[PDB]
Design a protein around this ligand. Structure first.
Ligand code: HEM
Length: 152
């Protein structure tokens, strides 16, 4: 549950992402894959990437970063009223991709890391607080659907 002022902060931060969605999406995925190499194993189309230089040179990885961040932005713009947008992603991630909730925690923290790395000094404590709460709400609502499905 976020206040109106907290949502305003989230959507202000998101404007930074929308100015370069592919660059942010690429770096989020690279932070996830290099920090948590077990996550790469869930992607048949990226498991061939051995080095970060290959990851950085991969245009398909940047393309997938755009898909991921476009979906998250659509959810965030609903300001919590995201049941219809979130349900298919919870279902595909539990039943087809088999993504444990832990990996959604990993990517949430990676988003925070990338925002500080690309906007140092311009991602304030209030903005971090609100973005973190928004990602927690997203993860928590996914977790509820995972429990419904019995997925661990
Ligand atoms: C911000 C969180 C995330 C968002 C919004 C997101 C969004 C999406 C979207 C829109 C798709 C394509 C449609 C679909 O299959 O449902 C996708 C595919 C996928 N997601 Fe996620 N995802 C997230 C986190 C993750 C994480 C943490 C992993 C694994 C560590 C992951 C693994 C996958 C895989 C394996 C695919 C299929 C890729 C393919 O082979 O083309 N996702 N995701």
């Amino acid at each position: 549950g976020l206040s109106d002022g907290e949502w305003q902060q989230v959507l202000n931060v998101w404007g930074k992402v929308e100015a370069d969605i592919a660059g942010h999406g690429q770096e989020v995925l690279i932070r996830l894959f290099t920090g948590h190499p077990e996550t790469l194993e869930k992607f048949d189309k990226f498991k061939h990437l051995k080095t970060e230089a290959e990851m950085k040179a991969s245009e398909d990885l940047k393309k997938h970063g755009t898909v991921v961040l476009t979906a998250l932005g659509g959810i965030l713009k609903k300001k919590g009223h995201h049941e219809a947008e979130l349900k298919p992603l919870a279902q595909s991630h539990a039943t087809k991709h088999k993504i444990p909730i832990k990996y959604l925690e990993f990517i949430s923290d990676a988003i925070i890391h990338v925002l500080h790395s690309k906007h140092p000094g311009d991602f304030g404590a209030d903005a971090q607080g609100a973005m973190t709460k928004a990602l927690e709400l997203f993860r928590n609502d996914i977790a509820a659907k995972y429990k419904e499905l019995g997925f661990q």
